[PDB]
Structures are given as C-alpha cells and as structure tokens.
Amino acid sequence: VDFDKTLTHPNGLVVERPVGFDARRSAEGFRFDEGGKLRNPRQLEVQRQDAPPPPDLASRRLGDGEARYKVEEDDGGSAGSEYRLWAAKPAGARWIVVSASEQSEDGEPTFALAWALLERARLQ
Amino acid sequence: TATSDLIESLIQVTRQEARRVIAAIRNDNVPDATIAALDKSGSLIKLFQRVGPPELARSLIASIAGRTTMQRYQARNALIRSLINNPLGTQTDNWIYFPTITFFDICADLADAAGRLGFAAAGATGVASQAIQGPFSGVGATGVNPTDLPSIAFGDQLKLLNKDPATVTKYSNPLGDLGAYLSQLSPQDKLNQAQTLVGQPISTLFPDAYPGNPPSRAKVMSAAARKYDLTPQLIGAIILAEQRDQTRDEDAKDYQAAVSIKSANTSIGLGQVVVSTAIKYELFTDLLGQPVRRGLSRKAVATLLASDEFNIFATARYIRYVANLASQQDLRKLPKTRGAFPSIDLRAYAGNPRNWPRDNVRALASEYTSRPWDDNLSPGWPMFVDDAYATFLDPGMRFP
Ligand SMILES: [Ca+2]
Ligand SMILES: [Ca+2]
Ligand SMILES: [Ca+2]
C-alpha cells in the first residue's frame, strides 16, 4: 500500500504518510523524503494553500474533482534528467498543493505516488 | 610493396581470402606505400568491391583508415568510388547508424587519437564476468556490448512505453539500499569487481582501428586521466559505482530505447553518460575531429556511448567539466553542500584529484549522478562512489 500514519497540521491539513518515507512538518504542511540513503530518492511536499493556483495550467481529473499542474524537466546526471511536478486541487474555498521530484532517464516519471498523495489529502 | 604485390595477386573473394588480405594489411610495415601502389594500379577500388559481406568490409576499412596517413584521403576516395553500386556498405548490424564513410572517418580519427593520447597498445586480455542477471551484470562486468544484446521483447517495449511499473523496474537500476549492497561484499570481493572492470579489453565497436588487439580499459582510463588532469582511480570509482548499479537488462534498454523511434535520452555505457549531455558538451571532442562530430546523428552518438573508449573519454571529460564548474562556485551559496561535505575545497577541484579532500570525491559523486552544484544532493551516491574509490586506492590496484 502507499500510505500509513495519519498526519495532521495545525492549519487543518490531514494526510497519511507515504510508506517508507521520513516525514517532517513544514510551514503549511508536510515534507516527505524517501527513507534510507538512496541514489535518487523521491521527495514530496503537501501543503494547504489559500491562494488559487496560477491561471492556465494543464488540468487533469482527480477523484471527483480536477487538479491543475505543471511538470518541469532539466539536465541532471547519470541517473537522468531532474523532474518536478507542482499540482493543486481545490479544498473548499482553499487549495491543497503537492510538489514532487525525482530523476528519470526514461522520460517523465508518472508521479503516481505524488498524485495519490494529492488525492488522499484533505483539509479539516 | 610486398603487401601490394600479394594483394594484387589475389585480384566476392572467399572468407578465407578476405581474412588473408586483411591480415596482410594489418601486418604491413609500409601501409602508406602499399595504398599508394594499389591506388596507382587501380586495384584498391577492386579490393573494396570484392571484400564483403559488411563484417569483412568493416575489418578491411578500419584497418586501412587506421594505418594510413599520407594516403588516407586517396583510400577514402577509392572507398567512396567503390560504394557507387553498393549503397549499403558497412551500414548493417551494430553499425547501422554510421554511414560507411562516417565509419571510415571514425576509425581514422580514433586510430590517430589512440596514438596521440597513449592508449593504442594492447596488453591485458581478460577476464570478464559471466553474470547475466543482477547488480554488476552490465558491460562493465561482462564485456558484452550493449549493442550486441538481443532485442527486448515487443510486449516489454510496449509496457515500457506505457510506463508499466514492473517492466520499468526490470530494466532500471537494480540497487535501492546502496550501503547494504556494499556491506555484503568482502574487501576482496570489491577488489575483484574493480580488477574485472578495468583489467579486461575494451568492448569496442571499432576493434580494427587499433594497431593490434584492443587495449585494456585501464590503459584507456589512464590516458583519459592524463588528458583531463584526473586520475584513473577516480574515473574507475565513478564507473565502478555506475556498473554496480547496472544490469544486462538495463544495458539493453539504455541502448535500444536510445535508438528506437522514441530517441530516448538514456544514460548509456560504462560511465552512464546521457545522450543529450554527450551532444551538448561535445564529450567526444578529444577522440573525434570537428567534421566527424558535426556529421554525427543522435543515434550515432548513442551508439558511440556504447563503445568503451568513447565512453571512458566522455565520462572523464564530463568529470573534469563538473570539477571545473565546482571550482567556480561560491560555497556560501551552497549551504546544503557544505553541510553534507564540510571539508569540501572548491578551489582544489581545479587541480588534480591527488590533492582533493575526500569530501570532494563524495560531493562530485553526488553531482555526477544528479544536476551539478544546484545544492540538491544524492544522499547515497557519495558513500557508494567513495567506497569504490577506496577500493581503487588499494596497492593491489595498478594502472598503466
Ligand atoms: Ca544504471
Ligand atoms: Ca542507464
Ligand atoms: Ca545535485
């Protein structure tokens, strides 16, 4: 499974920790770093955001709602290009934002875990 | 010459006759004079026309291009003339992305460079690993060229295209916990891997470009070290780390995806050099002249990354690039880098690795696997490469 421990931020953000990731609290959410000492660990952050996303981003279906997102790519190293996803979904009159990074030499990563994390998150 | 006379006497010939002629060209002490005689008599074009199939033609062409100097361009012209009714030439099998004249020119430039840089001469012979599965089963271990690997199954190609996790995993880096991978190996096991890696002949796509048998990887690494003010121990450490995190399957994917309809931007070969990065930084600069380089297709570049000498030189040139770049940075702007590697000495990078703090090796390792000097670090690659380095520092390890 993808997730274990339920985490709750004072700002009302609630989400489960990705299994095998170290969790720490950030300003408006949580940061997750893949555990151990890996070559190319996935890094994720999920936060409450009150301002709307920037306009005109690509959209996708997420659960019963939508999400707006953008992926960026840059030269990395022997483990491949660096990739970073930024995505936002509405939560009432506010938003929940996930950002995630990992390298890939095989094109854009699915970011399946980041999308699952964004879908799993809610505001209380 | 004796050789031109012998060749004219034998003038498709049989495989035996062809191997005889090629052997004669390769044993010739006066290659230029021989070519001049054959060019004058008009027999050179005939030689090029009568030596097939492509396997034999490649051996002949590589030998002639490599050994000629004063008569190289006349030889090239004779070859061109012989290709008028033979559009295919040497463009088959592993060499399908090299136009025949590009093959000639690559062999010429490579022979010249091996001479000039000091990696022409053979002397090691073996021995390669027989592994075909698991960590350290890529070309570094086995000497099996990625271009020689069987086509990936069609269905696997489709699942890879659609990013199917199980299939992607099968064809990707085999290691997760790097520390655990190393802790299961005895110091002797580690030395054995390093010696296997550097002691065996290069897996080269252009063997007849060399005056004799192909050189050891160690010889090529020493040459690259001299050229870029590195050490073969450092180049060796970077490559051994890559090759531990490599399988035969990954080699197959790396190359085949790069030359597929997708023109994938994979990391390929010994040092796991990324295709677009080899292009952007002209990483073959010291082995191939500008005309050849400006002519190379992307897929020709990927293919070259599968040839060990090109890959070793590209790897070393890139390491020197990363070090030079570091030497230009302001450590105050890299606080995470300083936190992880508190003894890092950025200026020291401009000079030879013998004088780098070990923290420099660790940091550069991070910035070889990932984007360099962005203050985002690989948590595990530095210790992994550093362990390989320590192995190469063993007194049992000797380079040319
Ligand atoms: Ca690899
Ligand atoms: Ca690769
Ligand atoms: Ca980096």
Author numbering:
A (entry chain B): 22 to 145
B (entry chain A): 2 to 12, 20 to 408
Quoted from the paper:
The T6SS of Pseudomonas aeruginosa transports two lytic enzymes, Tse1 and Tse3, to degrade cell-wall peptidoglycan in the periplasm of rival bacteria that are competing for niches via amidase and muramidase activities, respectively. Two cognate immunity proteins, Tsi1 and Tsi3, are produced by the bacterium to inactivate the two antibacterial effectors, thereby protecting its siblings from self-intoxication. It is now known that Tse1 functions as a peptidoglycan amidase with specificity towards γ-d-glutamyl-meso-2,6-diamino­pimelic acid (d-Glu-mDAP), while Tse3 functions as a mur­amidase that hydrolyzes the β-1,4-linkage between MurNAc and GlcNAc.
The two protein molecules form a compact complex with overall dimensions of 60 × 58 × 93 Å, and the molar ratio of Tse3 and Tsi3 agrees well with the 1:1 stoichiometry observed in solution. The results reveal that Tse3 contains a C-terminal catalytic domain that adopts a soluble lytic transglycosylase (SLT) fold in which three calcium-binding sites were surprisingly observed close to the catalytic Glu residue.
